[PDB]
Amino acid sequence: RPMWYPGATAPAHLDGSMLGDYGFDPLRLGVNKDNLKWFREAELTNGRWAMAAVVGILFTDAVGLPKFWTAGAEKYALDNQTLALIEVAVFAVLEGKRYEIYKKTGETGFLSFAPFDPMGMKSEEMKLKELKNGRLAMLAFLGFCSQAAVYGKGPIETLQLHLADPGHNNIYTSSVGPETAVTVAVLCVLPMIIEATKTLN
Amino acid sequence: ATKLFPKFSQGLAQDPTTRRIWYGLAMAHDFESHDGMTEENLYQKIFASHFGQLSIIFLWTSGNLFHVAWQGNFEQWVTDPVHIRPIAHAIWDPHFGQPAVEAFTRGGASGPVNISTSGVYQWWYTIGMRTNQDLYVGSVFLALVSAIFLFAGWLHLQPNFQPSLSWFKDAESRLNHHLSGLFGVSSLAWTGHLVHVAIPESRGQHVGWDNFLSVLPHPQGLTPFFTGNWAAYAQSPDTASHVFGTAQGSGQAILTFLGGFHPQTQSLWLTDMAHHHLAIAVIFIVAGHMYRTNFGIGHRMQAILEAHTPPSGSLGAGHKGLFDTVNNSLHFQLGLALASVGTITSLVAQHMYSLPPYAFQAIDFTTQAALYTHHQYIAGFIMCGAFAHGAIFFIRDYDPEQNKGNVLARMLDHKEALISHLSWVSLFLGFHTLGLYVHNDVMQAFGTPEKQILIEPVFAQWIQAAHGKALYGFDFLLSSKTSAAFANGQSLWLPGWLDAINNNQNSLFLTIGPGDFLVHHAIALGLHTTTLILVKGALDARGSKLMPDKKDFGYSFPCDGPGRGGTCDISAYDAFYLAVFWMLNTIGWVTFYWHWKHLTLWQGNVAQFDESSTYLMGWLRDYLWLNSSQLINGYNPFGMNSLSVWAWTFLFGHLIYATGFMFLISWRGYWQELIETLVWAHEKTPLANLVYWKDKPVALSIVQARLVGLAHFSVGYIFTYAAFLIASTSGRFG
Amino acid sequence: LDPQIVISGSTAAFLAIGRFVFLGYQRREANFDSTVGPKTTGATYFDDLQKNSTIFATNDPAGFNIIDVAGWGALGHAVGFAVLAINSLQG
Amino acid sequence: PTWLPGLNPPAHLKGALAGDNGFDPLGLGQDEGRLKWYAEAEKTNGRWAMMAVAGILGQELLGVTPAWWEAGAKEYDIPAQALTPIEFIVMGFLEIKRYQGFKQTGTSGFINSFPFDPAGMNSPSMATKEVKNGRLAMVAFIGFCVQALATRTQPIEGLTAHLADPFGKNITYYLTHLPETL
Amino acid sequence: PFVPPSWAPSVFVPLTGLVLPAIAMATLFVYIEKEAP
Amino acid sequence: ESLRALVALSGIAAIVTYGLKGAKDADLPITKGPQTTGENGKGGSVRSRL
Amino acid sequence: AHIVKIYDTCIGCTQCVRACPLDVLEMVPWDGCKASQMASAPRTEDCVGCKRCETACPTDFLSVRVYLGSESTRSMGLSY
Ligand code: CLA
Ligand code: CLA
Ligand code: CLA
Ligand code: CLA
Ligand SMILES: CC1=C(/C=C/C(C)=C/C=C/C(C)=C/C=C/C=C(C)/C=C/C=C(C)/C=C/C2=C(C)CCCC2(C)C)C(C)(C)CCC1
Ligand SMILES: CC1=C(/C=C/C(C)=C/C=C/C(C)=C/C=C/C=C(C)/C=C/C=C(C)/C=C/C2=C(C)CCCC2(C)C)C(C)(C)CCC1
Ligand SMILES: CC1=C(C/C=C(\C)CCC[C@H](C)CCC[C@H](C)CCCC(C)C)C(=O)c2ccccc2C1=O
């Protein structure tokens, strides 16, 4: 209930019953209670794969190995054609149970046999903790794809290019820079308009 | 069923036909007749709608700036504009073939661009643009302004900022602000832009948003303005050896009064336009303090209307009680507005072909043609709207007891005289004009062309001699060297005007003869006829003798059936409906005439016009037939060239037009029976009786089909003529 | 050719001619109550930006507010600068 | 009290709003709530004007290199393009704090989640001084702007150049000797 | 600082020729036929 | 809503990619272009005008 | 449904009733004319607006009017 801009409203179906509910849905996508049931696991799985991708994207660029946007380009691995067909069967098999175990139980688990908890670890109020970590990680992944972009160096290399350095080389002193200033100025003045929508009711 | 669409009219969203869709599209902007419509709500909706319209206008202009700046070649056009053609925008059509794109790539571009026959390039070159960057800045600015207007339109609907009814209907406070602010201050600021930017850009300089605060517009600067030495702003103006975009023969003056044209660019001087906007800025700002606001000295419009009733009672009550009908009704104000705007539009066209303001206009000829034709047709439609809203005023908003004895009731008292005399002049012009044309045709067809009537238009030639055209040997008032007017104006503003009026190469006061006599009478026939139809429709809207309670039906009702001999097309709507055809015809005559006279001017042989303009075969053979040679050769079994798109549009127009005849000639019930048999067929067909209509199919109603037929007629007419004009003029000179 | 003499004398002349002789004839047109005294019978905002709010007090024996001064001085300035401007084009 | 020598005060002066002089010749301050918004706007425009006049006069007395108008484009370390969004962000937070307090509870100003008054005094003898200095500062800053535009001087150059010669160096001079100063 | 990319007509033309008409006509058609409760 | 969302997803992901990978000659426009200076100087018939 | 109104200049000559192809008009007793009858329109929900009643009325400007209005499935004459 700390809203996404300090003094805000709550859209009329984002009450405090969801986990990460900071009351942000301006385009009215999830107006159903049937797509919320689905967008929640879209949120969790889209975030979850990215959480598992950030570790790899950092280690491959800390240890050595060639940069990720050209990872599979050159490949000492085996038979580019058919190992994707290996990457179809096991996955579709696994998807059968992911969607099936999504259907038969309520909106939480996925693995083949049960809601997967071989430990006695947290199945508690801290699912908001990992969906929070996930929605941090998704934003972290786009940044790396924008580093395979404009600068062309990896994460940790540009981390050295600016992050021991002053604010002389950052967004606004770079190729895609005049648009970000406009978007910052526009997004910042936007809750000042949303307040004007609901001040005059 | 009781469907949602549309919510403004409950009786309309009730029937199970397809009439509800068309009528819901048709009665949306008829705010006065929705469900639960008060008067305050009406004014507020109209206000917000105005904001919507402003948003669309500014967004559109931003679009033009953006496409010109991105896909055009304005940076290269400003170096040599008697050369490389303007570029409107670029094409990406996946339907093209190889020679198509190979053909359209013209004007120095790298892909399929098409030429800009709009005159935006000359406008933006005159006002002071020079590069692309400035155009982009303008586009961003105008898009931002459009967003502001859209937001305001949303704002003033919110229930705390909704203006009350009496904030509207405040005449005296709206005219002071419009006349002073909206006209005067805008004109003064435009003078500011001309003086600061447009002139020094025409001297050779880049006065931008950078360093306009540190550049003297005149090398003395606000000393003579505060001393009273104003004629020191006019000393040493731009030499007649001027080159526009450089500093060659550059003067120093900022406010002159020369007249004439620029000797190298064939436009008006910029200094004259600065001085003009300055002068009328002063006039409008002074005129904005006439009426009364929350202060002392103002006027009341009701007193002014009350006191102007003449003695002896040649008018009954004069203008008593008009102020409570101009203020209380919207269709009256809208009628006046459309009338004024239409006449002003015509004036815009008439002055912009003859006195071209923009640099290197009138050397791009397609620009002249398209601009003048465009504004003429726009003026026609606007004037027709004015009379239509007159008729709606009489039916909906007129009240007799409030208007007992003013001029408005007097006009309803003697309307048969008006309609009779309009009928008379229409008949007179028709008989004699058509007769003289047919007589000249017969004489030309037989071997004797000297046996025909060629009346010399001596009145207009008298006037042209009065303005200074020293060719007709009349010698008076501006053509005589010893006149008072000639000698008084001689020292400062005549010698430009005389050199511009005795040139036989510009459009200023073209030489005229008998063909012009005949065509001007044809034009007068058009105006009197169209006025006849419209005025008859307006004044007979309260009722006729065929039907004395037409006011109980509203504006647009179908008929009254077969009784009393049958009354088809009796509504005022149908009178205007008939008038639209005349508008299209009359503008057709003026535009054919203008176009051919300027084609013969730009080619070189005015003799062809002055000989072949006096008999209708001359028009058919020497204008419609000869000039459509490069058009219809836009594509053939041998190839295609630039004007293939025009040669396809040219047939497109005909197709729409001929479809237009169908809704006019063949009226309804036949189609009703046909559609009913279709309903049977789709109902009993096996394997396709699994899909039904939700709303029953019916034929178009009697009123609607008239509008649809007129839409096709007008659209096909416009597309055909535009195609011919652009293709012919740009094929020859372009 | 002094601008101060032309403008000052102009505004003085027009303020005088508005002070002494054209006062009552301007005050005979204050009576519009025969036709309009309720310009707007309104209650709130959007009606009192249209109705009178303030009355400019005059201890002037005849009653010139600042508005009449502004008007006659404005005409005086217009005419004075017209005189200087017609004088401006080399006589 | 009132601007003219004689006026019957309209329906915005009852006896006190913040500090009042009955000056509404056009008659805007009448809508209820809207006049309150105008009051808060007057106060905050005054606040930025006071900080601005302090800014220019402090820049000039402390001996900075350019004048106040050419101070936007010398050079900095960030230096110019990344200075807009940071401003927008910081002013965003503070400002939406200000408004979102002012709308709900505190119909006076503050800075952060308060009615702001750590170590000061609150009495109308301070409110009227605040509003009066605010008006004085708005008029002052527009004076700086137009004066700088016409004379191309820093303000104390203007004041000392006027004190060296009262009869002369007036607005008539700098408006009728404009090519001398450019 | 503003320039649209070279590939911009190729994408924006069929978008506004085929997609927005499709969404517009489908949405409007659902709106037209709706029954009031 | 499901298949109606699916047709949106596929329609977008087909048309938008048709823009920049429907470069399989599209007959003329897509970076195959005018390989001859087609009608640059050919503009007018009496006056050339480029 | 359309709007059918009978006015007082009626002389009660029964022409409108015999011309109506839908039986929405009927003659009621009245004490205002020589024939002691007057037409009436008790069933204007069946009217389609063909305006034969207007054609059959003898008295000048008519004693019966048919004002057109909001159509329905019966006032359009649709048989399907
Ligand atoms: C893409 C994965 C994804 C999905 C499916 C969701 C789904 C959801 N989020 Mg969510 N979220 C995400 C990522 C995602 N989130 C990320 C990355 C952030 C951090 C930036 C957030 C931050 C966030 C907040 C703060 C809140 C939600 C909420 C919600 C729920 C209700 C709102 C709704 O209807 O959303 C439906 C949304 C979709 C179906 C996504 C559609 C994707 C669009 C069409 C394309 C987006 C592309 C983007 C504009 C371009 C790239 C952006 C980049 C440049 C920054 C819903 C379950 C609200 C809630 O109930 O609390 C949990 C809420 O308050 N989210
Ligand atoms: C100074 C203050 C001011 C100003 C600037 C305006 C301005 C405007 N008011 Mg407005 N208004 C004011 C005070 C003011 N009003 C007051 C005090 C009241 C209360 C009484 C109102 C009440 C009011 C109402 C009720 C409405 C407006 C509307 C409008 C808009 C008219 C539409 C338009 O764009 O016309 C533009 C007109 C011109 C630019 C002048 C045209 C002059 C000639 C005909 C054109 C030819 C000149 C030249 C050749 C053109 C060059 C062409 C170029 C391309 C080359 C306009 C924005 C209307 C509107 O749109 O609402 C949104 C409306 O409905 N106002
Ligand atoms: C200042 C501009 C203006 C304004 C504000 C109005 C406002 C109004 N007019 Mg009006 N009018 C105007 C100009 C204006 N008119 C002009 C210039 C004409 C002359 C043509 C008319 C003729 C006119 C008539 C004859 C009538 C009105 C009516 C009305 C009222 C209802 C409008 C309505 O429901 O239409 C709804 C609008 C539509 C359904 C749009 C129809 C689309 C038209 C046919 C154009 C289609 C052409 C097409 C786009 C071409 C495409 C080409 C293709 C190849 C792409 C409304 C008060 C009506 C009224 O008061 O009813 C009693 C009425 O009967 N007006
Ligand atoms: C309103 C004026 C206007 C008009 C008529 C056009 C016309 C055109 N533009 Mg365009 N454009 C405009 C303004 C305009 N532009 C502006 C202001 C921008 C800057 C954002 C652009 C940016 C732009 C690009 C980047 C491209 C075009 C392209 C095109 C062409 C293909 C149509 C298309 O896909 O457009 C798409 C247009 C847009 C995405 C911009 C429109 C944005 C506004 C907000 C929409 C307006 C809504 C409209 C008024 C409602 C009508 C629909 C309603 C009846 C249901 C066509 C010639 C294409 C082209 O050049 O091909 C050669 C192309 O790739 N435009
Ligand atoms: C129906 C109606 C209406 C409308 C109407 C209209 C539409 C009208 C129009 C009108 C018009 C449209 C008119 C026009 C006019 C014009 C004129 C009237 C002109 C004049 C001119 C002049 C006067 C000139 C003069 C001169 C000369 C000759 C030359 C030299 C200069 C001078 C200036 C001297 C209304 C709304 C009212 C309402 C009622 C109904
Ligand atoms: C105290 C007193 C006195 C005195 C008084 C006085 C003397 C007053 C004055 C007053 C004044 C002295 C006023 C003035 C005013 C002014 C004005 C009001 C002005 C205006 C201006 C204008 C209006 C202008 C305009 C323009 C321009 C800007 C330029 C040119 C053009 C034009 C015209 C547009 C005595 C001793 C008698 C005694 C009693 C008491
Ligand atoms: C053909 C015809 C019909 C039949 C017309 C019908 C059945 C409608 C035909 C339109 C079809 C259904 C769609 C036409 C396609 C258009 C592009 C639709 C445009 C819709 C706008 C909203 C854009 C009549 O009902 C009629 C009535 C009176 C006089 C003349 C005629 C007449 O000529």
Per the structure block, which two tokens stand in for B308? 């102007």
CB contacts, 8 Å: C49 with chain D: 27-28, 30
Nearest to B20 by CA among G48, E37, G72, G3: G72
Pull the structure tokens for residue B664: 């006019």
Q: Binding-site residues of D for chlorophyll b, please?
A: 47
**Ligand (nearest to CA of B675):** 7
Beta strands in B509-646 (DSSP E): 635-636, 639-640
Residue F50, helix vs strand vs coil: coil
Which residues does B233 contact at the CB level (< 8 Å), separation at least 6? B218, B224, B225, B253, B254, B255
Nearest chain B residue (CA) to E32: B5
- Identify the nearest ligand to the CA of B339 by its number: 5
Q: What contacts A166, CB < 8 A, 6 or more positions away?
A: D77, D78
Ligand 7 closest atom vs CA B668: 28
F36 to chain B: closest CA residue? B102
Q: How far apart are CA D85 and CA A172, in angstroms?
A: 9
G13 is in an annotated binding site: yes
- Give the whole-angstrom CA distance, residue B389 versus residue B338: 9
Known binding residues of B are 559, 568, 654, 662, 670-671
Q: Tell me which residue in E9, E10, E33 faces B694 most closely, judged by beta carbons.
A: E33
Token pair, residue B48, equals: 């917000």
Cβ B698 vs Cβ B21: under 8 Å: no
Q: Which residue of E has its CA nearest to B92?
A: E9
d(CA B631, CA B730): 10
Nearest to A158 by CA among A175, A143, A180: A143
Q: How far lies F50's CA from each of A67, B35, B84, B725, D136, in Å?
A: 51, 60, 5, 20, 64
Collapsing DSSP states into helix, strand and coil, what is residue D46?
helix
Residue A151 marked ligand-binding = yes
User: What is the atom index within ligand 5 of the atom nearest the CA of B387?
Assistant: 1
Q: Collect all residues with Cβ–Cβ distance below 8 Å to B198 and sequence separation of at least 6.
A: B126, B127, B128, B270, B274
- Which positions in chain A touch D92 (Cβ < 8 Å)? 188-189
The β-bridge partners of B733 are: F47
* Spatial separation of the C-alpha atoms in residues B200 and B64, rounded to whole Å: 25
Q: What residue has token string 């206009």?
A: B361
- Least Cα distance to B62 among B154, B131, B147 occurs for B147
Amino acid at the residue A170? N
- Neighbour subunits, A (≥3 Cβ pairs < 8 A): B, D
d(CA G71, CA C23) in angstroms, rounded, equals: 68
Q: Does residue B161 belong to the interface with chain A, where contact is any CB pair within 8 Å?
A: yes
Which of chain E's residues have a Cβ under 8 Å away from the Cβ of F15?
Answer: 14-15, 18-19
Task: List C-alpha distances in Å: B723 to B46, B653, B715.
Answer: 37, 8, 12
Residue G29 parent element (H or E)? strand G26-29
Lookup: tokens for B536:
């008859």
CA nearest to B167 within chain C:
C46
Distance C13 CA to ligand 6 centre (A): 11
Mutate to test the pocket of ligand 1, among A32, A35, A39 (most ligand atoms within 8 A of CB): A39
List, chain by chain if needed, residues with CB within 6 Å of any ligand 4 atom.
Answer: B 59-60, 62-63, 66, 89-90, 92, 143; E 4, 8-9, 12-13, 16, 24
Measured in angstroms, how far is the CA atom of residue B221 from the centroid of ligand 5? 43
Residue B595: both structure tokens together: 């176009």
Name the strand (E) or helix (H) holding B597: helix B572-603
- Tokens for B264, please give them: 């190298």
Q: Where are the domains of chain G?
A: 1-80
Q: Tell me the DSSP string of B641-709.
A: -TTHHHHHHHHHHHHHHHHHHHHHHS-SHHHHHHHHHHHHHHHH-TTTTT---SSB--PPPHHHHHHHH
Q: Number of folded domains in chain C? A: 1
What is the Cα–Cα distance from A163 to B570, expressed in whole angstroms? 83
Measured between CB atoms, which of C45, C59, C66 is closest to D31?
A: C45
Residue A45 buriedness (CB in 10 A; 0-12 / 13-18 / 19+):
middle
Q: How far is CA B732 from CA B77, B130, B605, in A?
A: 21, 29, 15
User: What's the distance, CA B358 to chain centroid?
Assistant: 19
Ligand 7 atom with the shortest distance to the CA of B667: 29
Contact A54, A149 (CB under 8 A): no
To which residue do tokens 């060719």 refer?
B471
Q: What's the Cα-to-Cα distance from B483 to each of B281, B480, B491, B495, B499, rounded to whole Å?
A: 32, 6, 14, 15, 18
Cα–Cα distances in angstroms (integers) from residue B174 to residues B168, B182, B303, C46, C67, in the given order? 9, 10, 17, 13, 20
Q: A152-179 burial by CB neighbour count: b if 16+ within 10 A, else e?
A: eebbeebeeebeeeeeeebbbeeeeeee
Choose the residue to mutate in C10, C64, C67, C77 for probing ligand 6, maximizing ligand atoms within 8 Å of C-beta. C77
Instruction: Say whether B164 and C42 touch across the interface (CB within 8 A).
Output: yes
Contact B324, B416 (CB under 8 A): no
C74 CA distance to ligand 6 middle (Å): 6
Burial E5-19 (b: 16+ CB within 10 A, else e): eeeebbbebbeeeeb
Transcribe B541-573 into DSSP letters.
TS--SS-TTGGGS-S---B--SSTT--BT-SHH
Task: Identify whether the C-beta of residue G75 lies closer than 8 Å to the C-beta of residue G49.
Answer: yes
Tokens 């009615």 belong to D115
Please identify which residue in the block is written with the tokens 């238009």.
B457
Compute the distance between CA of residue B683 and CA of residue B692 in angstroms, rounded to an integer: 8
Tokens standing for residue F25: 């000659």
Cβ contact B468:B501 at 8 Å: yes
Q: Which ligand has an atom closest to residue A33 CA?
A: 1
**What is the rounded distance in angstroms from the CA atom of residue B67 to the CA atom of residue A55?**
46
Measured at the CA of B11, the angle between CA B10 and CA B17, to 5 degrees, comes to 115
Q: How long is chain B? A: 734
Q: Which residue of B29, B530, B581, B714 sits with most ligand 3 atoms within 8 Å of its CB, as the best mutation to test the pocket?
A: B29
User: Which of B82, B92, B102, B728 to substitute to test the interface with F, most F CBs within 10 Å?
Assistant: B102
Sign of the Cα pseudo-torsion (B507, B508, B514, B519, in order):
positive
Amino acid letter, residue C78: A
From the list B488, B459, B455, B461, the residue with the least C-alpha distance to B473 is: B461
Q: Count of alpha carbons within 13 Å of E30, Cβ hemisphere only?
A: 7
Instruction: Collect all residues with Cβ–Cβ distance below 8 Å to C83 and sequence separation of at least 6.
Output: C6, C10
* DSSP assignment letter at B232: G
* In CATH, D34-180 is 1.10.3460.10: yes
First to last CA, chain C: 11
- In a 3-state reduction of DSSP, which class is residue G6? strand
Q: Tell whether B418 is within 8 A of chain F (Cβ).
A: no
Decide if G61 touches B, using CB distance below 8 A.
yes
Distance in angstroms (rounded) separating the CA atoms of residues B141 and B620: 49
How remote is the CA of residue C43 from the centroid of ligand 1, in Å?
49
Of all atoms in ligand 3, which is nearest to the CA of residue B554? 62
Give yes or no for a contact between F27 and B94, defined as CB atoms under 8 angstroms apart. yes
CA distance B609 to B600: 6
CA of A141 to the centre of ligand 1 (A): 15
The residue in chain F having the minimum alpha-carbon distance to the alpha carbon of residue B108 is: F40
3-class secondary structure per residue, B258-280: CCCCCCCCCCCCHHHHHHHHHHH
Among residues B309, B342, B292, B302, the alpha carbon closest in space to that of B323 is found at B302
- Assess B214–D contact: CB distance below 8 Å, yes or no: yes
The Cα B253–Cα B238 span in angstroms is: 7
Which residues of G fall within a CB distance of 8 Å from B553? Answer: 67-68
As given in the structure block, the two tokens for residue D82 are 């990344």
CA neighbours closer than 13 Å in the CB half-sphere of residue A63: 8
User: Residues of B forming the annotated binding site for [4Fe-4S] cluster?
Assistant: 559, 568
Protein residue closest via CA to atom 40 of ligand 2? B183
Could you identify the residue written with the tokens 């009660």?
G12
E abuts D (3+ Cβ pairs < 8 Å): no
Q: Contact partners of E by the rule of 3+ C-beta pairs under 8 A?
A: B, F
Instruction: Return the H-helix or E-strand segment holding G5.
Output: strand G3-6
CA B504 → CA B362, B471, B490, B498, B543, distances in Å?
14, 11, 22, 12, 55
Is the CB of A134 inside a 6 Å radius of any atom of ligand 1? Answer: no
- Does the C-beta of A29 come closer than 6 Å to ligand 1? yes
CA B182–ligand 2 middle distance (angstroms): 6
Q: Both tokens of residue C19?
A: 């002070």
> Determined by which method?
cryo-EM
CA–CA gap between residue A122 and residue B723 (Å, rounded) = 76
Task: Tell me which chain F residues have a C-beta less than 8 angstroms from the C-beta of E11.
Answer: 16, 19-20
Containing structural domain, residue C31 = 1-91
| Measured CA distances, A16 to A31, A124, B367 (Å) | 15, 17, 64
Selected residue of B173, B210, B215, B222 to mutate for chain D interface (largest D Cβ count, 10 A): B222
Phi, psi of D100 (to 5 degrees): -75, -10
Q: How far apart are CA D58 and CA D144, in angstroms?
A: 13
For residue A47, which atom of ligand 1 is closest to its CA? 2
Helix or strand or coil: residue D60? helix
**DSSP three-state, residue A101:** helix
Single-letter amino acid code for the residue at F44:
G
Distance, in Å, from the CA atom of G16 to the CA atom of G24, rounded to the nearest integer, reads 10
Q: Name the residue with the closest Cα to ligand 7, atom 10.
A: B700
Task: List helix spans (H) across D118-167.
Answer: 124-151, 155-163
| Rounded-to-10 torsion of CA B590, B595, B598, B603 | -150
Q: Tell me whether residue B279 is exposed, middle or buried, using C-beta atoms within 10 angstroms of its C-beta: 0 to 12, 13 to 18, 19 or more.
A: middle
d(CA B92, CA A162): 42
